[PDB]
Amino acid sequence: MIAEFIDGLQKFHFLQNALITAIVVGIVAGAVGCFIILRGMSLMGDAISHAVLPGVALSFILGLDFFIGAIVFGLLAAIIITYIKGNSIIKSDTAIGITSSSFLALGIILIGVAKSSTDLFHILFGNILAVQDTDMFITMGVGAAILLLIWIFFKQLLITSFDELLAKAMGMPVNFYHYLLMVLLTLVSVTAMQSVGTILIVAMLITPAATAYLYANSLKSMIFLSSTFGATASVLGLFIGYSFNVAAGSSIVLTAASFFLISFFIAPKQRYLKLKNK
Amino acid sequence: MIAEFIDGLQKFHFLQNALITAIVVGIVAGAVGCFIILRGMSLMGDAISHAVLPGVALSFILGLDFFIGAIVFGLLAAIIITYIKGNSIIKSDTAIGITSSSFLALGIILIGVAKSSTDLFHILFGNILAVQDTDMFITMGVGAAILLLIWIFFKQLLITSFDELLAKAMGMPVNFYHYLLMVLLTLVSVTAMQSVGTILIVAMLITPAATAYLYANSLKSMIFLSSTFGATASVLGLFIGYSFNVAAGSSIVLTAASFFLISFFIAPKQRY
Amino acid sequence: MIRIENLSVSYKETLALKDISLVLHGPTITGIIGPNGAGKSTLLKGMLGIIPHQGQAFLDDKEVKKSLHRIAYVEQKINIDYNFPIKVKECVSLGLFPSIPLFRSLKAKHWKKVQEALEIVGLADYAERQISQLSGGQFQRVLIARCLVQEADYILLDEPFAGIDSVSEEIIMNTLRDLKKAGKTVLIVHHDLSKIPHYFDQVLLVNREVIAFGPTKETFTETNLKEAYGNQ
Amino acid sequence: MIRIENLSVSYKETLALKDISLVLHGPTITGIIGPNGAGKSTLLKGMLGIIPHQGQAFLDDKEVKKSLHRIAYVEQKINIDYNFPIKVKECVSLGLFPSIPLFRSLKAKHWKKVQEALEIVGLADYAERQISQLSGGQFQRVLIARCLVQEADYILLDEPFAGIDSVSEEIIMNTLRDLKKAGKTVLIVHHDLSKIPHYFDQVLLVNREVIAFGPTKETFTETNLKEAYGNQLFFN
Numbered sequence A: 001m002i003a004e005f006i007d008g009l010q011k012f013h014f015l016q017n018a019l020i021t022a023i024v025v026g027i028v029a030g031a032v033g034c035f036i037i038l039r040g041m042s043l044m045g046d047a048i049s050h051a052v053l054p055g056v057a058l059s060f061i062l063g064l065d066f067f068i069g070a071i072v073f074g075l076l077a078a079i080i081i082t083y084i085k086g087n088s089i090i091k092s093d094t095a096i097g098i099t100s101s102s103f104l105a106l107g108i109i110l111i112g113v114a115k116s117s118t119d120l121f122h123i124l125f126g127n128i129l130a131v132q133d134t135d136m137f138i139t140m141g142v143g144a145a146i147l148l149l150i151w152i153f154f155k156q157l158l159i160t161s162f163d164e165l166l167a168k169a170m171g172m173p174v175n176f177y178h179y180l181l182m183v184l185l186t187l188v189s190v191t192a193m194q195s196v197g198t199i200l201i202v203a204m205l206i207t208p209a210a211t212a213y214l215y216a217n218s219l220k221s222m223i224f225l226s227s228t229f230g231a232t233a234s235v236l237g238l239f240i241g242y243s244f245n246v247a248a249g250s251s252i253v254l255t256a257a258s259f260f261l262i263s264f265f266i267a268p269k270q271r272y273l274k275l276k277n278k
Numbered sequence B: 001m002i003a004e005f006i007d008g009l010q011k012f013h014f015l016q017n018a019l020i021t022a023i024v025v026g027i028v029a030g031a032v033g034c035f036i037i038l039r040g041m042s043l044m045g046d047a048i049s050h051a052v053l054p055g056v057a058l059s060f061i062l063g064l065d066f067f068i069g070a071i072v073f074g075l076l077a078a079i080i081i082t083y084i085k086g087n088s089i090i091k092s093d094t095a096i097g098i099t100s101s102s103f104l105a106l107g108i109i110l111i112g113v114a115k116s117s118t119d120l121f122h123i124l125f126g127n128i129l130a131v132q133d134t135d136m137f138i139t140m141g142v143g144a145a146i147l148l149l150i151w152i153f154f155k156q157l158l159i160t161s162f163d164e165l166l167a168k169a170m171g172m173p174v175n176f177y178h179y180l181l182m183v184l185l186t187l188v189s190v191t192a193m194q195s196v197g198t199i200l201i202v203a204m205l206i207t208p209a210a211t212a213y214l215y216a217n218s219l220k221s222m223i224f225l226s227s228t229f230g231a232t233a234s235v236l237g238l239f240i241g242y243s244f245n246v247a248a249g250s251s252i253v254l255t256a257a258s259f260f261l262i263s264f265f266i267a268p269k270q271r272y
Numbered sequence C: 001m002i003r004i005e006n007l008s009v010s011y012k013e014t015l016a017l018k019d020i021s022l023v024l025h026g027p028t029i030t031g032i033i034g035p036n037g038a039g040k041s042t043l044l045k046g047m048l049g050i051i052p053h054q055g056q057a058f059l060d061d062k063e064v065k066k067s068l069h070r071i072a073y074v075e076q077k078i079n080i081d082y083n084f085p086i087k088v089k090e091c092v093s094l095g096l097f098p099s100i101p102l103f104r105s106l107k108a109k110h111w112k113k114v115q116e117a118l119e120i121v122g123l124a125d126y127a128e129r130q131i132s133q134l135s136g137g138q139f140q141r142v143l144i145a146r147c148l149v150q151e152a153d154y155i156l157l158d159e160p161f162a163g164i165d166s167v168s169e170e171i172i173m174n175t176l177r178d179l180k181k182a183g184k185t186v187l188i189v190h191h192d193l194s195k196i197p198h199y200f201d202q203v204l205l206v207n208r209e210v211i212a213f214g215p216t217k218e219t220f221t222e223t224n225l226k227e228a229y230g231n232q
Numbered sequence D: 001m002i003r004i005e006n007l008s009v010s011y012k013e014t015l016a017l018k019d020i021s022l023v024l025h026g027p028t029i030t031g032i033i034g035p036n037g038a039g040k041s042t043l044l045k046g047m048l049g050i051i052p053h054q055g056q057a058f059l060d061d062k063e064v065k066k067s068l069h070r071i072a073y074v075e076q077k078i079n080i081d082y083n084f085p086i087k088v089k090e091c092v093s094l095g096l097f098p099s100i101p102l103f104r105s106l107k108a109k110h111w112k113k114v115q116e117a118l119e120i121v122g123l124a125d126y127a128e129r130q131i132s133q134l135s136g137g138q139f140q141r142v143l144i145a146r147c148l149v150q151e152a153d154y155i156l157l158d159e160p161f162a163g164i165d166s167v168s169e170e171i172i173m174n175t176l177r178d179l180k181k182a183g184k185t186v187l188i189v190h191h192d193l194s195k196i197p198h199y200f201d202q203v204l205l206v207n208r209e210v211i212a213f214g215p216t217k218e219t220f221t222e223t224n225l226k227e228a229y230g231n232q233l234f235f236n
């Protein structure tokens, strides 16, 4: 079972593209995911994943680039979320719930009129085994762009995530780096559609990062661990789905969930259960 | 358009059951949905719906009722969330997102072994156009049980949602009604597997409630309006899906969202 | 009588409230004073068992947690959601909910108390209003009206004179004086050090521990206040 | 010279600060005192421009908002997340980030400042350690070391002595006394009314309005205090 998987990666061109795409998604989603959970944006990660769908669908029929539509509809949601709060008694979480599900429903309608039933199922859940070369190289390009952007603004993202009140006292544009992460989040979301699909994007952001949060002693250490857990969980899940003939996206997420479950007990910081016991 | 829909409701059998089932889901999700948004449980509402999937999946394999598995796995998720908070550094919103996505993935695999992917799609997104009589009568029965429980504990659900701090001072079991409300939530979730589906239940919970919240001057009035907007959106949504041959579950949600968008501007409280 | 034994409440690492032993006698209007965030408001929640605490508390040869029907707790305005859809009379009627069992409704005799309670606090013509439409002073009178309908022998308020107009203060204070005349105990957590001998006949100075407790003129001194607010 | 002119703040409808006008000369260690939640902490935020406010504030002719590099702000310990993954030296190094431009990193020059700042506050052995693995006193000294590396002419500390041991309290106060000797204004929102004449040479008693302002001996009196804590309605 392990032997023929290695053999398949040598023969087949579709399994090679599945491996490289799964790796890159796992690395980049886990890297961005660190900032998502540290800044308290776990909900927003799920909301933007849903808000991107109608933009990706509308960008297809118009004949435009997939990443452009994701940002427009991704920002339209964030505008509405803030606009609902600012002009009514509707709470924040309710505004995020209404706008995310409404955009999700809109996306399903726009996909249905243009594309087939199998395309909708794949957009929502994965299709890692049928990614083309152009999609693979663009995923590497945009994925590497996300990483080097974080590398450039690492010091600025550090203070704003840890101590935003100190950043404001120094005169830093805290709003600029908030929108930067949301611009990066949309690029991760459309990239993650290939492996885990629209419905399970949130898992690839928060689950590896949450696991790395239990171990890491620094932001750099946390990103490295979050990407390693995400990348490893992406490879194992591919091996699980391909061999046992089960959903690749769910297998990838369950592997990440099991890493969190194992780490929840065996992590040094988690072994402060002795504190609560006595 | 309208003549064809009315003609269809007389000749076609699934469209009759689709109408009846959609009404009942819209009414009950609207009523329960009021309590969700007033108590600030919109986030938890979405997670419980996802946590229901593995229970309903595992329930079919063992040959039990879907409601039993959903309640067990639904409350299991809620127990895991608080357990993550209390025994780790991980925050609430992260813990809710982790458990719901993990349970949803677990549900997809558990459905995969017994059922097919078309069955997974129907549990997750509707199958409104093919609900059977046995399913309709169960939906009406369990839906009526939800409305009765709300009617019986109306004053108790009112005082705990508004002023929980006073209810604690009076010596009321505030946790009992919190768990009672989450049981109603899980019953609506499995009931919603025959209209909007597991993924879009939250929409039918919070959106009709939020729309009614703009008009309502009391909780009784709010529930009436939320169920009215929930029922009407379920009817017009089915009409859109039937007429244009598109996903009815999504059409029902967009209709509910459109009422909210209109109500955002025209409502008396929104003006003043 | 409200007797307390070694009542403590932990915030997280350090104690918010530390070993409170005390015996309060009635009838009275008692004032709990001290620095903001240093025990005042926590004492009432720990006493009623609203939050987890380590000590005990008694009401007349009986435990407080088995006598909540005899107490009326009026929380701070800040905690209450004003956007919640509810009329003034409906908010007042919440005080009657303990006396109504399951499968039963509020009869005409219960609305009589709601209409009478509003008339005592001067909000008879605001019965059908939403609580969002009322002012800060007016809303406190609604909470006091909600307290009156419970008909409690013991009344626990939390900063009821904080951020209100002088017309409301007069109405609220006159209502509390009448409760003391009816032979009932009133325990108020005061927001500052304003009008201590006017409001209170007994004063309880608090900063983690009990700094001082007793009649106002004797206990409300320069030395005690310096010990409480000065800390070191 | 700090220069505040008709500054006001409103968190929700009501006024947190009401028409604040003041001119503080230095060098000094000035103590902002009064009831907790009445304006003390909001003044430092309104002064810096971290929150919306009706009014202006200046630092030696030039405006506050256009001269933030000259100021250093040390917020309360409650606002900072202790569980965040960051070492002590890495937390102190955050003060230098404004001096570093984009596309540039911390050379050996900058890390030398960080270790020296820790040697001053007495945490040289805690540099390779988590901020979660520290006491309240020690963590406060890390925030003061983080303040030192900015080399700010003005220092704003929000309740630094709230919930710390006496060993840390003395080390912190020695550091602030050195900053006073360097010729710099140190403005501190105090958490209670402890050691006022010992710590502070000037006092700013705040309760929405400015009740009193001037030298400690002259202003730190029972008349002024009872007006503030009594809210203009103190009974004897």
Ligand SMILES: OC[C@H]1O[C@H](O[C@H]2[C@H](O)[C@@H](O)[C@H](OCCCCCCC3CCCCC3)O[C@@H]2CO)[C@H](O)[C@@H](O)[C@@H]1O
Pocket: A056, A066, A118, A119, A122, A123, A126, A127, A130, A131, A132, A134, A135, A136, A138, A139, A190, A191, A193, A194
């Ligand atoms: O358009 C032509 C293709 O259409 C299908 O494949 C589609 C399929 O409909 C869907 O299952 C998947 O969705 C994958 C996720 C789509 C979301 C956008 C992904 C982004 C990733 C970053 C680069 C741009 C695309 O796409 C592939 C093509 O790649 C069929 O396999 C075949 O007809 C052909 O290969």
